[PDB]
Design a protein around this ligand. Structure first.
Ligand SMILES: COc1cc(Cl)cc(CC(=O)Nc2cnccc2C)c1
Ligand SMILES: COc1cc(Cl)cc(CC(=O)Nc2cnccc2C)c1
Lengths: 304, 304
């Protein structure tokens, strides 16, 4: 029993963290095989960020200008290229610690572990969700750029996120490992506002099932609802509309608890309309939306 | 910016996780140097747990009865002994992945990362606090026993906790790495109730400073208080009494924000007496007490 915002073990990702320096800028790099991936804004100075011409800026850089250090040993750069907002620095040594890996572009509402790093060294690990507005609510400071988000399937690390920037609104934006930003964000020091963030309804429902599994059942009521009626209440509270796919994805949790998805929706409807009335669910006084139905099943079954 | 319940990178601890089997019982072991540490209840069967005589039970066991497997390779057991509620299985091979380590018995109110494991394999990592009543609110299932709690100081892992049991109340009890339980708990299937849990006041104050550092200042008021007056309000809300040592420990956070400790206490006093009025602090609708002043400084400065 017990339910926590649990991150994946970070060991396989720590063995990939390197330090990338270009001129006076230092950030984190991800070393896999003979390639180091890092945000392309490493080539910029603070003066360049207002409207950088990355193609022009990169042209004034050669392999020798990119200092790559793994722990305390220097890597020799034999190639360099820009793929969207990431630089791929080809090194002459394959990372002996490269795990089995994939590059995946995650869907909004999905979750992942972040290995926050500074100067190629890991500082901490936490669970995040890609918000419906494609921002992440992480914990990042200057030098954290290049830190990565990932998931693990037994021995395979799926890299989904690379951290690039913090917006003036305090939220975090970044790319997949091919350099494509999640959302409308650009790697430029300009006014950028994220869209309206919604609550991930399927995740809140998944977390209600985790609460039921872990003994917190006070919010269970004698009511039911339909997808259409629930969605009217979801729209008013800026929750993501619930689809039949979401109901299907909640199937394993519904079978484990014996509580129908639409009955759980009715408990959620009453929680939205009436609040928590001072009570808590899984030690929280608000509806948690950063646990997918897969995260709930995983944590409640002990998948290693 | 951003504030998360951040765990330490678990890499150094994953390299120590082994599987210990004794008869029909399988749990996790911690392999450091040529010694594997695991909860002594590994020698019990479900029939023995009502009132086990561990000395008698251990006497019917020999080195060959303890199956220790690290990944997929079998370790040879050349010695075995009971130190309080832990068994120390001496193996003929030193763990090549042993990090620099210490065994520390933590103080209540202090925090640590848990590497939850099943069958010697890590499933996840999360931040915990040793509650004032010496229980932990973790996430553990059957087979999670032997999972460890720890902290890291650059290259040194300080092992503070080994998971042993879940109480009927759904809370978690365990030992330090010398086998001494935190709290009054015994490794026996009997009725055991934890004491009254209090809120770690110095941690809630530390988290209020993190909220101020990260932009959430709505709760800051035009008031102040004294240690004696604040403590009258802390007693009523079952918060730990605030001492001058706690004020001193909050000094670095007070200097960074420019907000005196007693002024922050006054904001907390008003939050206790009036609630959050529907608002949130750092994405939470309740007062968070599982971040020490050291955790706040670390996260807000980027210590790797
Ligand atoms: C000045 O314009 C910038 C533009 C880009 Cl694309 C990147 C940066 C660096 C940056 O945002 N670092 C950072 C990331 N997360 C938390 C905090 C910080 C300070 C700056
Ligand atoms: C039956 O008496 C017991 C006594 C002790 Cl000392 C230990 C156990 C095993 C246990 O508690 N495992 C566990 C730990 N955390 C979460 C869930 C579980 C099921 C059982």
């Amino acid at each position: 029993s017990g339910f926590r915002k649990m991150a994946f073990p970070s060991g396989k990702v720590e063995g990939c963290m390197v330090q990338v320096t270009c001129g006076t800028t230092t950030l984190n790099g991800l070393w896999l095989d003979d390639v180091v991936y890092c945000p392309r804004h490493v080539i910029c100075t603070s003066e360049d960020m207002l409207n950088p011409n990355y193609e022009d800026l990169l042209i004034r850089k050669s392999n020798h200008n990119f200092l790559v250090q793994a722990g305390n040993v220097q890597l020799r750069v034999i190639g360099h290229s820009m793929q969207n907002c990431v630089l791929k620095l080809k090194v002459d040594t394959a990372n002996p610690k490269t795990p089995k890996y994939k590059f995946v572009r995650i869907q909004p509402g999905q979750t992942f572990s972040v290995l926050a790093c500074y100067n190629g060294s890991p500082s901490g690990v936490y669970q995040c969700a890609m918000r419906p507005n494609f921002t992440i609510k992480g914990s990042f400071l200057n030098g954290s750029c290049g830190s990565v988000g990932f998931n693990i399937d037994y021995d395979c690390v799926s890299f989904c996120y690379m951290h690039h920037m913090e917006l003036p609104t305090g939220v975090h934006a970044g790319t997949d490992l091919e350099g494509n930003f999640y959302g409308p964000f650009v790697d430029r020091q300009t006014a950028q506002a994220a869209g309206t963030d919604t609550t991930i309804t399927v995740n809140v429902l998944a977390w209600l099932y985790a609460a039921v599994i872990n003994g917190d059942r006070w919010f269970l009521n004698r009511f039911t609802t339909t997808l259409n009626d629930f969605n009217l209440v979801a729209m008013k509270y800026n929750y993501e509309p619930l689809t039949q796919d979401h109901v299907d994805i909640l199937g394993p949790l519904s079978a484990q608890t014996g509580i129908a998805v639409l009955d759980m929706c009715a408990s959620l409807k009453e929680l939205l309309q009436n609040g928590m009335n001072g009570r808590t669910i899984l030690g929280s006084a608000l509806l948690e939306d950063e646990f997918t139905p897969f995260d709930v099943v995983r944590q409640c079954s002990g998948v290693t």
